[PDB]
Amino acid sequence: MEYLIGIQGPDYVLVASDRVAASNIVQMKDDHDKMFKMSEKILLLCVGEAGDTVQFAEYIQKNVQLYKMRNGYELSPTAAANFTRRNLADYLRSRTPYHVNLLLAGYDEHEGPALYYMDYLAALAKAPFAAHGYGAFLTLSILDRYYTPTISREKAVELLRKCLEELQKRFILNLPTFSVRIIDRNGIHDLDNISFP
Amino acid sequence: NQYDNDVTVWSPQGRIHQIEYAMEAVKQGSATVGLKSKTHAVLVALKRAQSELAAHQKKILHVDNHIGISIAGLTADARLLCNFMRQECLDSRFVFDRPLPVSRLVSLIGSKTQIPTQRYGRRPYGVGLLIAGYDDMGPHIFQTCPSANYFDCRAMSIGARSQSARTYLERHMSEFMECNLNELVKHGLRALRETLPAEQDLTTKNVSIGIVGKDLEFTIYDDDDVSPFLEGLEE
Amino acid sequence: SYDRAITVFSPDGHLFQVEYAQEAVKKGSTAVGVRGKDIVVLGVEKKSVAKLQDERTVRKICALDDNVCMAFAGLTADARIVINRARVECQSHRLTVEDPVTVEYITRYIASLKQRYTQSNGRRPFGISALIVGFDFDGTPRLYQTDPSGTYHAWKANAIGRGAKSVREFLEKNYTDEAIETDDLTIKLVIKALLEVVQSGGKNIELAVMRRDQPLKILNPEEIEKYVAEIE
Amino acid sequence: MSRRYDSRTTIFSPEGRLYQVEYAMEAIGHAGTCLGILANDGVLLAAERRNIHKLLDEVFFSEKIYKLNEDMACSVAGITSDANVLTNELRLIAQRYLLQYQEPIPCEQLVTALCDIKQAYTQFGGKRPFGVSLLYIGWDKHYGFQLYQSDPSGNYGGWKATCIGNNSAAAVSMLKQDYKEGEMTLKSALALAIKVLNKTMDVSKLSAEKVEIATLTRENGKTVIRVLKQKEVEQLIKKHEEEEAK
Amino acid sequence: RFSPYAFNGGTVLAIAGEDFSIVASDTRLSEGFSIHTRDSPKCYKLTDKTVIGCSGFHGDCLTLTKIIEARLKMYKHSNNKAMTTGAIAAMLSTILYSRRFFPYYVYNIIGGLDEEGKGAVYSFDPVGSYQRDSFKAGGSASAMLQPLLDNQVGFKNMQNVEHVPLSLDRAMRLVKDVFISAAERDVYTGDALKVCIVTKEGIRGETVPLRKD
Amino acid sequence: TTTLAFKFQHGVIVAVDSRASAGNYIATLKVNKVIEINPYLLGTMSGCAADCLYWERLLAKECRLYYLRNGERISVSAASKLLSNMMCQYRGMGLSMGSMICGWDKKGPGLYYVDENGTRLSGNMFSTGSGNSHAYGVMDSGYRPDLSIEEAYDLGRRAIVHATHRDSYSGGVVNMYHMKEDGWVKVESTDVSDLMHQYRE
Amino acid sequence: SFSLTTFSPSGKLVQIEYALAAVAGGAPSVGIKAANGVVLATEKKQKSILYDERSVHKVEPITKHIGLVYSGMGPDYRVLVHRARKLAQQYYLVYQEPIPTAQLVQRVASVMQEYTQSGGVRPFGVSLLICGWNEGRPYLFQSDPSGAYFAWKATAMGKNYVNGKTFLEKRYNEDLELEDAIHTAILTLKESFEGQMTEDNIEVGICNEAGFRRLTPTEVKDYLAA
Amino acid sequence: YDRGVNTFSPEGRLFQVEYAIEAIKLGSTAIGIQTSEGVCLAVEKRITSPLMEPSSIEKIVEIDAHIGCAMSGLIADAKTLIDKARVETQNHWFTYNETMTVESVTQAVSNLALQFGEEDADPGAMSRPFGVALLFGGVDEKGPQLFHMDPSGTFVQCDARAIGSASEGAQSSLQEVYHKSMTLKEAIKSSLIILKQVMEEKLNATNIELATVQPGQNFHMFTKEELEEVIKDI
Amino acid sequence: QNPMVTGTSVLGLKFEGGVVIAADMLGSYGSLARFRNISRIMRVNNSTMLGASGDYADFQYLKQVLGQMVIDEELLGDGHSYSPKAIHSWLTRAMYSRRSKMNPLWNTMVIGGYADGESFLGYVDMLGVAYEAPSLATGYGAYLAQPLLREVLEKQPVLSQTEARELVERCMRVLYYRDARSYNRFQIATVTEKGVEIEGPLSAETNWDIAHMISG
Numbered sequence A: 001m002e003y004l005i006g007i008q009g010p011d012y013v014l015v016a017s018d019r020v021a022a023s024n025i026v027q028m029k030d031d032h033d034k035m036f037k038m039s040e041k042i043l044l045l046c047v048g049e050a051g052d053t054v055q056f057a058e059y060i061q062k063n064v065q066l067y068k069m070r071n072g073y074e075l076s077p078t079a080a081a082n083f084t085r086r087n088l089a090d091y092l093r094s095r096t097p098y099h100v101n102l103l104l105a106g107y108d109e110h111e112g113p114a115l116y117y118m119d120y121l122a123a124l125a126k127a128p129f130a131a132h133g134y135g136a137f138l139t140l141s142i143l144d145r146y147y148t149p150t151i152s153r154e155k156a157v158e159l160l161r162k163c164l165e166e167l168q169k170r171f172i173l174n175l176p177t178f179s180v181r182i183i184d185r186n187g188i189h190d191l192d193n194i195s196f197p
Numbered sequence B: 001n002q003y004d005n006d007v008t009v010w011s012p013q014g015r016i017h018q019i020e021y022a023m024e025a026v027k028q029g030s031a032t033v034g035l036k037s038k039t040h041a042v043l044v045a046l047k048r049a050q051s052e053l054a055a056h057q058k059k060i061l062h063v064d065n066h067i068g069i070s071i072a073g074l075t076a077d078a079r080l081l082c083n084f085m086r087q088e089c090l091d092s093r094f095v096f097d098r099p100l101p102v103s104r105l106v107s108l109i110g111s112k113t114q115i116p117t118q119r120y121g122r123r124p125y126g127v128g129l130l131i132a133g134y135d136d137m138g139p140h141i142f143q144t145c146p147s148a149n150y151f152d153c154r155a156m157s158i159g160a161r162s163q164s165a166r167t168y169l170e171r172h173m174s175e176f177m178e179c180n181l182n183e184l185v186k187h188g189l190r191a192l193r194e195t196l197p198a199e200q201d202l203t204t205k206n207v208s209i210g211i212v213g214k215d216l217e218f219t220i221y222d223d224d225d226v227s228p229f230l231e232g233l234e235e
Numbered sequence C: 001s002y003d004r005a006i007t008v009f010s011p012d013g014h015l016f017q018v019e020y021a022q023e024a025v026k027k028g029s030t031a032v033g034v035r036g037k038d039i040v041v042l043g044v045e046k047k048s049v050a051k052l053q054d055e056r057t058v059r060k061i062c063a064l065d066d067n068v069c070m071a072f073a074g075l076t077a078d079a080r081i082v083i084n085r086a087r088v089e090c091q092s093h094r095l096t097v098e099d100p101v102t103v104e105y106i107t108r109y110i111a112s113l114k115q116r117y118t119q120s121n122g123r124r125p126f127g128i129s130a131l132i133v134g135f136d137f138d139g140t141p142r143l144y145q146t147d148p149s150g151t152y153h154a155w156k157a158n159a160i161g162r163g164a165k166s167v168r169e170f171l172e173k174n175y176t177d178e179a180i181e182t183d184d185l186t187i188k189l190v191i192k193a194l195l196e197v198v199q200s201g202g203k204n205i206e207l208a209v210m211r212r213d214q215p216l217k218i219l220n221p222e223e224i225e226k227y228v229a230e231i232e
Numbered sequence D: 001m002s003r004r005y006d007s008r009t010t011i012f013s014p015e016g017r018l019y020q021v022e023y024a025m026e027a028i029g030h031a032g033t034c035l036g037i038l039a040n041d042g043v044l045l046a047a048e049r050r051n052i053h054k055l056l057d058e059v060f061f062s063e064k065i066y067k068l069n070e071d072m073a074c075s076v077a078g079i080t081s082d083a084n085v086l087t088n089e090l091r092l093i094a095q096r097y098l099l100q101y102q103e104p105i106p107c108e109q110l111v112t113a114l115c116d117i118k119q120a121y122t123q124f125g126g127k128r129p130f131g132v133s134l135l136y137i138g139w140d141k142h143y144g145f146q147l148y149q150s151d152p153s154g155n156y157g158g159w160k161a162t163c164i165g166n167n168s169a170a171a172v173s174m175l176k177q178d179y180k181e182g183e184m185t186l187k188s189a190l191a192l193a194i195k196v197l198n199k200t201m202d203v204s205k206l207s208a209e210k211v212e213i214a215t216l217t218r219e220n221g222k223t224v225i226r227v228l229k230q231k232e233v234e235q236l237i238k239k240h241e242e243e244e245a246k
Numbered sequence E: 001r002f003s004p005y006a007f008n009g010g011t012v013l014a015i016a017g018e019d020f021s022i023v024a025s026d027t028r029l030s031e032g033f034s035i036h037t038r039d040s041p042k043c044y045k046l047t048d049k050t051v052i053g054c055s056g057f058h059g060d061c062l063t064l065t066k067i068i069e070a071r072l073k074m075y076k077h078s079n080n081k082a083m084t085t086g087a088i089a090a091m092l093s094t095i096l097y098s099r100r101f102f103p104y105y106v107y108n109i110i111g112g113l114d115e116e117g118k119g120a121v122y123s124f125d126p127v128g129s130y131q132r133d134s135f136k137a138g139g140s141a142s143a144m145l146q147p148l149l150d151n152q153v154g155f156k157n158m159q160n161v162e163h164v165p166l167s168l169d170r171a172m173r174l175v176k177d178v179f180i181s182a183a184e185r186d187v188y189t190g191d192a193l194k195v196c197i198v199t200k201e202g203i204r205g206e207t208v209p210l211r212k213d
Numbered sequence F: 001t002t003t004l005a006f007k008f009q010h011g012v013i014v015a016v017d018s019r020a021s022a023g024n025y026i027a028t029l030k031v032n033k034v035i036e037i038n039p040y041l042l043g044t045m046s047g048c049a050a051d052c053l054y055w056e057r058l059l060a061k062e063c064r065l066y067y068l069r070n071g072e073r074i075s076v077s078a079a080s081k082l083l084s085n086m087m088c089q090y091r092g093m094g095l096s097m098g099s100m101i102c103g104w105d106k107k108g109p110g111l112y113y114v115d116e117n118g119t120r121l122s123g124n125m126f127s128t129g130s131g132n133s134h135a136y137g138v139m140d141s142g143y144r145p146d147l148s149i150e151e152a153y154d155l156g157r158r159a160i161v162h163a164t165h166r167d168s169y170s171g172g173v174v175n176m177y178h179m180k181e182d183g184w185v186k187v188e189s190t191d192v193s194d195l196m197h198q199y200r201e
Numbered sequence G: 001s002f003s004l005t006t007f008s009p010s011g012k013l014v015q016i017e018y019a020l021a022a023v024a025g026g027a028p029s030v031g032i033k034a035a036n037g038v039v040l041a042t043e044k045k046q047k048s049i050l051y052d053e054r055s056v057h058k059v060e061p062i063t064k065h066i067g068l069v070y071s072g073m074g075p076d077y078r079v080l081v082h083r084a085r086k087l088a089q090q091y092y093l094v095y096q097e098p099i100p101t102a103q104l105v106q107r108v109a110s111v112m113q114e115y116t117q118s119g120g121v122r123p124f125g126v127s128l129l130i131c132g133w134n135e136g137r138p139y140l141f142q143s144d145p146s147g148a149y150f151a152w153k154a155t156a157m158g159k160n161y162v163n164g165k166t167f168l169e170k171r172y173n174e175d176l177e178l179e180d181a182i183h184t185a186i187l188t189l190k191e192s193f194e195g196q197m198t199e200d201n202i203e204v205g206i207c208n209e210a211g212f213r214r215l216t217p218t219e220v221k222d223y224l225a226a
Numbered sequence H: 001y002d003r004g005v006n007t008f009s010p011e012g013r014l015f016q017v018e019y020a021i022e023a024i025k026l027g028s029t030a031i032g033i034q035t036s037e038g039v040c041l042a043v044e045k046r047i048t049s050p051l052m053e054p055s056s057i058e059k060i061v062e063i064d065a066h067i068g069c070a071m072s073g074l075i076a077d078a079k080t081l082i083d084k085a086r087v088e089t090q091n092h093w094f095t096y097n098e099t100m101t102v103e104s105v106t107q108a109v110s111n112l113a114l115q116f117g118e119e120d121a122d123p124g125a126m127s128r129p130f131g132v133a134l135l136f137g138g139v140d141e142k143g144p145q146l147f148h149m150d151p152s153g154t155f156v157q158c159d160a161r162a163i164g165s166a167s168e169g170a171q172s173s174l175q176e177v178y179h180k181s182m183t184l185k186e187a188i189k190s191s192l193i194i195l196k197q198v199m200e201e202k203l204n205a206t207n208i209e210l211a212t213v214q215p216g217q218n219f220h221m222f223t224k225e226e227l228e229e230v231i232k233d234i
Numbered sequence I: 001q002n003p004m005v006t007g008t009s010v011l012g013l014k015f016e017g018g019v020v021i022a023a024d025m026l027g028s029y030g031s032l033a034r035f036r037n038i039s040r041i042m043r044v045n046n047s048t049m050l051g052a053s054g055d056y057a058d059f060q061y062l063k064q065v066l067g068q069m070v071i072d073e074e075l076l077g078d079g080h081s082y083s084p085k086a087i088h089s090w091l092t093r094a095m096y097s098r099r100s101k102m103n104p105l106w107n108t109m110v111i112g113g114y115a116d117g118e119s120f121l122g123y124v125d126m127l128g129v130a131y132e133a134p135s136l137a138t139g140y141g142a143y144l145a146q147p148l149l150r151e152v153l154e155k156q157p158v159l160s161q162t163e164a165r166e167l168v169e170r171c172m173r174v175l176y177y178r179d180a181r182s183y184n185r186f187q188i189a190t191v192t193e194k195g196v197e198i199e200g201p202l203s204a205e206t207n208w209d210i211a212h213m214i215s216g
Helices: A050-071 A077-090 A136-146 A153-169 B017-026 B077-095 B102-118 B163-171 B173-178 B181-195 B226-230 C016-027 C076-096 C103-119 C164-174 C183-193 C221-228 D019-029 D080-101 D107-123 D168-178 D186-200 D230-243 E058-079 E085-098 E146-152 E168-185 F049-069 F076-089 F130-139 F149-166 F193-200 G014-024 G074-095 G101-115 G161-168 G178-192 G217-223 H015-026 H075-096 H102-114 H167-177 H184-198 H224-232 I056-076 I084-100 I139-143 I145-155 I161-177
Strands: A004-008 A013-018 A021-023 A026-029 A035-037 A042-048 A100-106 A114-118 A124-126 A129-131 A178-184 A187-190 B032-036 B041-046 B060-062 B067-073 B127-135 B138-143 B155-158 B207-212 B219-221 C031-035 C039-044 C061-063 C068-074 C128-135 C141-145 C157-160 C206-211 D034-038 D043-048 D072-078 D132-140 D144-150 D156-159 D161-164 D211-219 D222-227 E012-016 E021-025 E029-031 E034-037 E050-056 E106-113 E119-124 E130-132 E193-198 E203-208 F002-008 F011-017 F020-022 F025-028 F035-038 F041-043 F097-103 F111-114 F120-122 F173-178 F185-191 G029-034 G037-043 G060-063 G066-072 G126-134 G137-143 G149-151 G154-157 G202-208 G211-214 H030-035 H038-044 H134-140 H143-149 H208-213 I010-015 I018-024 I042-044 I048-054 I107-115 I118-123 I186-192 I195-198
Touching: A004 A042, A004 A100, A004 A114, A004 A136, A004 A153, A013 A042, A013 A100, A013 A114, A013 A153, A026 F120, A026 F130, A035 A050, A042 A050, A042 A077, A042 A178, A050 A077, A050 A100, A050 C076, A050 D107, A050 F076, A077 A100, A077 A114, A077 A124, A077 D080, A114 A129, A129 A136, A136 A153, A153 A178, B017 B067, B017 B127, B032 B067, B032 B127, B032 B138, B032 B163, B032 B181, B041 B067, B041 B127, B041 B138, B041 B181, B067 B077, B067 B207, B077 B102, B077 B127, B077 E058, B077 H102, B077 I084, B102 B127, B102 B138, B102 I056, B127 B155, B127 B207, B138 B155, B155 B163, B155 B181, B163 B173, B163 B181, B173 B181, B181 B207, B181 B226, B207 B226, C016 C068, C016 C128, C031 C068, C031 C128, C031 C141, C031 C183, C039 C061, C039 C068, C039 C128, C039 C141, C039 C183, C068 C076, C068 C157, C068 C206, C076 C103, C076 C128, C076 D107, C076 F076, C103 C128, C103 C141, C103 H075, C128 C157, C141 C157, C157 C164, C157 C183, C164 C183, C183 C206, C183 C221, C206 C221, D019 D072, D034 D072, D034 D132, D034 D144, D034 D168, D034 D186, D043 D072, D043 D132, D043 D144, D043 D186, D072 D080, D072 D211, D080 D107, D080 D132, D080 G101, D107 D132, D107 D144, D107 D156, D132 D161, D132 D211, D144 D161, D161 D168, D168 D186, D186 D211, D186 D230, E012 E050, E012 E106, E012 E119, E012 E168, E021 E050, E021 E106, E021 E119, E021 E168, E050 E058, E050 E085, E050 E193, E058 E085, E058 E106, E058 H102, E058 I084, E085 E106, E085 E119, E085 E130, E085 F049, E085 H075, E106 E193, E146 E168, E168 E193, F002 F097, F002 F111, F002 F130, F002 F149, F011 F097, F011 F149, F035 F049, F041 F049, F049 F076, F049 F097, F049 H075, F076 F097, F076 F111, F076 F120, F130 F149, F149 F173, F149 F193, F185 F193, G014 G066, G014 G126, G029 G066, G029 G126, G029 G137, G029 G161, G029 G178, G037 G066, G037 G126, G037 G137, G037 G178, G060 G074, G060 G211, G066 G074, G066 G202, G066 G211, G074 G101, G074 G126, G101 G126, G101 G137, G101 G149, G126 G154, G126 G202, G126 G211, G137 G154, G154 G161, G161 G178, G178 G202, G178 G217, G202 G217, H030 H134, H030 H143, H030 H184, H038 H134, H038 H143, H038 H184, H075 H102, H102 H134, H102 H143, H134 H208, H167 H184, H184 H208, H184 H224, H208 H224, I010 I048, I010 I107, I010 I118, I010 I139, I010 I161, I018 I048, I018 I107, I018 I118, I018 I161, I042 I056, I042 I195, I048 I056, I048 I084, I048 I186, I056 I084, I056 I107, I084 I107, I084 I118, I107 I186, I139 I145, I145 I161, I161 I186
Parallel strands: none
Antiparallel strands: A004 A013, A004 A129, A013 A178, A021 A026, A035 A042, A042 A100, A100 A114, A114 A124, A178 A187, B032 B041, B032 B155, B041 B207, B060 B067, B067 B127, B127 B138, B207 B219, C031 C039, C031 C157, C039 C206, C061 C068, C068 C128, C128 C141, D034 D043, D034 D161, D043 D211, D072 D132, D132 D144, D144 D156, D211 D222, E012 E021, E021 E193, E029 E034, E050 E106, E106 E119, E119 E130, E193 E203, F002 F011, F011 F173, F020 F025, F035 F041, F041 F097, F097 F111, F111 F120, F173 F185, G029 G037, G029 G154, G037 G202, G060 G066, G066 G126, G126 G137, G137 G149, G202 G211, H030 H038, H038 H208, H134 H143, I010 I018, I018 I186, I042 I048, I048 I107, I107 I118, I186 I195
């Protein structure tokens, strides 16, 4: 059960994904990047059954790239999750139901940076921060204590280390390496990969 | 005039001119002849080359061990019926594990030939088919037409300049039943002599044959074994 | 449905329907394109509107992808269907293969459609001829022209539309290694290629450029006049 | 079947054009005169009614002016029967867009969507093309106030001002002369339609019943569309009534 | 209710000599513990150099035999040539996968001469995998015959013993005695033995009796 | 049944065993799991044997198609990309196939792992099969990014040795395939049993 | 499988142009919308006294509040009756309400639009007058073979419609009672129809707050007092 | 136009197909060669402008390692047929795990050519015949084989067959020069002599394309190396 | 699919220039013996015949298909007849497609035939198992009559109609004893060079004296 987490600040959206892809008792690829890029200001992060993550992500990814070419502009973060929800809902009752839990982040010149939560049943929700997997128990409860709507993006990553260290302490599965990115009006900004030497 | 446009339009004399011109295209090409005795049947096909550099076209299409056919008419139009006829013969041994009877096959081929005729938009097959086969009742020579009509003949010559060939076949028809396999090929090749002018007559290179028999499956000969078949015969 | 043959042969062997299709290609506006050294540049003349039309829908220089762009000369009708379904192939190729699109790969699938439309029952051959130009891997540019008949060629310098043969005469004569040397000389060649068929047109020339990793860029009217200012 | 009676629209003329499309543009010219203007404060639409009789009623909102969606509208000049087919298809494309992205469709996207359906019958199918020419108005999130004109061949384009139907050469000529680009707004430029509709109509004494005017303006973050009051349009014509004297 | 197949027993073993290939199997056909008939030849000759036995459910053997021969003669008339022993291998492998969702239950062993004249053996499995080996087995007794195959042909687990290439005389001793030993202890083998040998001239087939129980 | 391969500066080394068994009973000791695709592309086998044969041969066709099409010698990443697609069509119909993708292109000696559900994973060091767990331990003790080709085989040999030693389903004889720029080469086919006396004493 | 309707060099539709020419060559038909109801008057002309009048009626109801008349080819009108009635029932399934007049005639004329487009089918040779009552508003519409439906306070069609419109330019006034509008329509057809004027030849029906109701020959005989 | 596609003539010919074979007279002159040591095919590129790249246009493409191609008349008609020809060729090896014989190549193409029709079919069917004259060569275990195909769809084994505009006098000229055991290098000589004589432009490495197939050497496309050598070794 | 009209054992044996086929006239619904008069045996042209077991319902459908197929060749007058092989070949292939479609006809059939002095006898199964043996049984008759036949076939491989039918009379005599679903009525169909000859219903005399030997 891989773990995703994300946080939406006023001017920013902080997202973090575990890089470990494991099978049975061993880690296949521990640094494998789960973060996918829908467009310049809009990314997507998915977790779930192995094949469903990779495969279904290309659908939303390539089809949004087709939109920008016709109308000359990218979709809005709201239209993104919408277009993502219906396609996942239409394929939910099909012969091959997909198991994926995804966080959708993006920026807009009006709505600003946005974060949208989605389950495996394609139920869309707008929350300041959300997580996936079993790790959401040990983490999001900490965020409820220390979060404020005015929190700076600097103290964000500083706060995220408190939730991530609980995964190495109490939480059973390793997840040694974590990927961190942040999105604002200036575009995607990559950050340090947190590791415990 | 205005009645020659398609098959559906009937002439005031009650004739379809497209079917009439379908029989004309058969007369526009290589003349083949075949005959059957009480035992063996032979199909003599005349191979023609466009030039001397180009080789001779293949007028014989192998169907099955007990069945073979020669084509006279538009070349590629026989390819559609070929793959169909081969598929029908395979389906017979695929289900019944038995070779399809010769008379039953031609009746099924004549059906597929007639279906596109009355239906507008489908071109009728413009190639004639001379098919032979052997069964428990002996060999059979079945000549067809683009009109889908098919007969049963002791010997038949179709194509251009087949007039003098048929006249030779009628007078010698009484011998065709009692002759053995060797004499069937001889008189069968001398019947092909009348289909060509007095300059170019016959060679072993441009003439191929095939035979089917009691215990002998249908085989195809072109040059090697045909040379002793032709030589030793007066013309 | 509607099922019959449209294009049929002739007693001389030539195709009536296809020749009239290429005739409508020449009746359209004059479009040009060249394959530069490190870049590619497209251009097309603009029929002069009087103080009315908006240039958003009128623009005849489009982009199929970040790697490849295109221009068209002919009936504006059939041009938009090809642009749409080619962009679908660009995303479908990236959906099927993680590697990006190839200019030669996308070009053939385009002209292959016009070949299908010619021999299909009830369909019609298009009256458009499109210039497919883009960047291949390692940065090697490629310029290809389509045909209503379905064939596609390769061109270093090309001109389509009205007076395409007239501009081609200027091409073959004035195209040398001196041509398309630099980004400036490549653009000035496209302008001069549009100066033969222009009658008192002036500013009507609009240009476009794609530079290396960057996607198709439209030169502003003032940036166009900067290169047009030098003639004599 | 009877290929003798098959007209084969897909056949090109020896001049390299289409038979039906060329005759379709002429049929549009016989229709009523309709114009439109793109201004700063919004879009302007005015249409003449060629049908004139004492028994006419027109219980609907307007004759040649229809409402595509919340943010867009349209006019029509051409065959009146095939107009309802295109109007329904525009309402289908716009609402199917609202399903996926849950947002209003931009002006340029809805126009190019139907033009692909218009020319699809000229490409194949053997069915006759459409003889309907449509004007498009509305507002979108990006480009804002927009005015579009369509052709029966499927071609289209943006326009600041234009005219369709009868008197196309005279009206468009009179339009450009006094047209103020990005300057003269709804209030002022509304007097031009009445001025043009009086010149395009050969019968003098332009009547407010013989014409129809509708405008669309987004105010306070909400798109507002209405059909102008005939009693006020009369006073708007009373302006033009006193214009030749003063 | 309904079982798509039932195990019918039977055993097929094929050893490929240097220039020859010997294929031998019993005629015993049974269902569960019930016997059908004592003459049920598994080996089916296709072309001059090709003979194939099929060990498994007997009904699925005939359908493949017909579909194979359907493609064989169809290949012949179309391609004007017979299929090589190696060509039938990859052909039937694609035939098995088309039915993958409704798997044929059989053990297919191809035998005959290759293009070089050597004996070739191709062993298949119900899912359609294929491989080439000098000696293969199939069926229930295939488990019991392996040590005797790894001894005479295999030469494994002996201390400094010369490795002689197998001969026809040894094979007739080997292949029979391993079946004589298998038919004793295994219930699914016996009642007769048929041997199919194909050389450059053609097929040579003979039948040798086994224990009647 | 054990299949392992790992990427390194000098190319990739593929090390598998020869024994594929049905149940506790050994089918054949000499089974060849490694499958040939192109001179520069080499396939593997895991799980169902027939599913590896068919699809990689179908991919071998696809590798020829595009090569008979654009003649570009399709990249290794696009290979597994095309393989992922075709496998996701029948996903859920019962196809279980483990496998690996080895090859060399302009990017380098690409190594990719493909699952039954279409999972596509690149990386430096892989493994799969029943007894694969015994391989990770001995292989992960010590590492040099740049491998000496000889001791690299020894690291591959000693892996398979102790791996197949603990696992009952892994065994037979050693199969070893080095990867090179132009094309791969088969290093050796060696018995596992006789390699013990070396390591044993 | 091919549409025979093409554009004339003048732009007119030749097949539809001759469609109305067949409509004008039929029996005259008129209608008037006044006060709370709408009247439709048609003339049924048999070929002898041997044909039953009450067997087949030209005025037919569609739904409770809607009815239709016609002038043109008889058989072409029977196709529209089945398609209009079936369309109104498909309406009642979705919205569970009676169908309004504007919604009905729209999609009913769409059937005319389909057969003037889809291939292998000739256009209709009929023109229908639409009568409906919804939400207190009387609705009188006129449809043509091309499928264009308009709105009319009063109208005339069929034969001698030019003189029929001339009567409506005078005899038709505003604030006119429905009963007087019926006798007014009789005065309109007084000049057109000749010979013996009876209650069986003329066929009249109306629609009002109580709904569309066809008139019996006995009631028409009282309405013939003029 | 006042005639059908399948309408028979009073002389027993098809209006459609007759103009097909009549249309191919405007194509580019190309000649195939069958030798005891291999198969040789040459084609004239017929470039209408220096800006047009003769390297991008290819009238000879590789289906299998044995089989080559040839093109004349309308180029895209051949590309449509070669596409499906390469699909069924790999479908052969996908099943039988062997290379398709030269005969089975033309059998698949002859089937695709015979399917031409309009009514009573799907829209994905080819309505009119191709204006291409096809030459399919190759070398297999049976030895070198060269086949000729016209819009009719027939295939016949022949030593050499001329196609294109000059096919009239070229085919009679190929008869005279080619005889007996004449090999590859000796075939290229008489090939470039007859082709250069009939075409307008002079022989050049970029004005024509040449490729050969041998028993030991598979299909090998001649680059600037081999092309510039054979033109000066003529 | 359902318990529909289940059948009983089916016995057949080759002899010189002919085939003996015997089957009971009892249809059986579940454990109940319900229909005691039915026609199990059908004559197919002159030289061939068919009899079956298992579901009698599904048989009549496939029994009817053969009738229409025999008409096809009789209308042609080609001078040929369906061989027992081809019918046994068509039957094995036709019933085979029922297994791939997951709707198998549940039956066990036996085909007698006489061709040019060589009498063909054949066996088929629902699942498609087919072979040729001189003695064929169905169901528990394979557990009873089959070893009794092969006991005599060892000493007398060649038999005439005399001892063949007389042995079959003794075969079904045991089917009363150890087969609970058998019944008194049975039919004897003999195919000779004169064509199929089907005798009417017959009975069998049996000896129950084992009952009185218990008290001893």
